[PDB]
Design a protein around this ligand. Structure first.
Ligand code: CA
Ligand code: CA
Lengths: 182, 16
């Protein structure tokens, strides 16, 4: 059974009654006997709802977050893990996963170019309504990219590593809000 | 109840 395997994943995504993941699967399965969810289709999900904005680039970014998770395609299992990080963790360990979504290239360190991508994509998710309500010296992915990169303290020859990435947030507990894709 | 509409959009979407 699916849930069984995922349950094995344990805390990494225990979620509610893990049995709920089983019923889900059967539903998501019948709703799409595709079995292998491709990035294109997933992008269809975000392109069909998100009326507030057009997180198109963001939807494709998340897909790469758990798709390239050493496999090939986004299976329902990987789908639940995504729906779990989207908004659920609050006391368990998940930052490690954050080091990936915030990194599309692959993994080693987070460079200004890596965040820049997620930042640009996010910008799209931010409709004009809110964007228009932005202060000064901060209205572009390039200007904000300097706010996050500067929040850590890493010049050019300074690639944020997976460790410090967690420490940069351990000290200044004022990042969690910004770093949040939201 | 709070920021739960996001997870509900990805799942409720691939659902219906
Ligand atoms: Ca995958
Ligand atoms: Ca990286």
């Amino acid at each position: 059974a699916l849930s069984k395997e995922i349950l094995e994943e344990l805390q990494l995504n225990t979620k509610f009654t893990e049995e709920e993941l089983s019923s889900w699967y059967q539903s998501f399965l019948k709703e799409c006997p595709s079995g292998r969810i491709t990035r294109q289709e997933f992008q269809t999900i975000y392109s069909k709802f998100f009326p507030e904005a057009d997180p198109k680039a963001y939807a494709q970014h998340v897909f790469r977050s758990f798709d390239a998770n050493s496999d090939g395609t986004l299976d329902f299992k990987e789908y639940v893990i995504a729906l779990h990080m989207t908004s659920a963790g609050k006391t368990n360990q998940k930052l490690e996963w954050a080091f990936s979504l915030y990194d599309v290239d692959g993994n080693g360190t987070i460079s200004k170019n890596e965040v820049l991508e997620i930042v640009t994509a996010i910008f799209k998710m931010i409709s004009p309504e809110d964007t228009k309500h932005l202060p000064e010296d901060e209205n572009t992915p390039e200007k904000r990219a300097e706010k996050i990169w500067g929040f850590f303290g890493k010049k050019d020859d300074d690639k944020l590593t997976e460790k410090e990435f967690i420490e940069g947030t351990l000290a200044n507990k004022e990042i969690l809000r910004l770093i949040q894709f939201e | 109840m709070d920021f739960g509409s996001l997870e509900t959009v990805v799942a409720n979407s691939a659902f219906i």
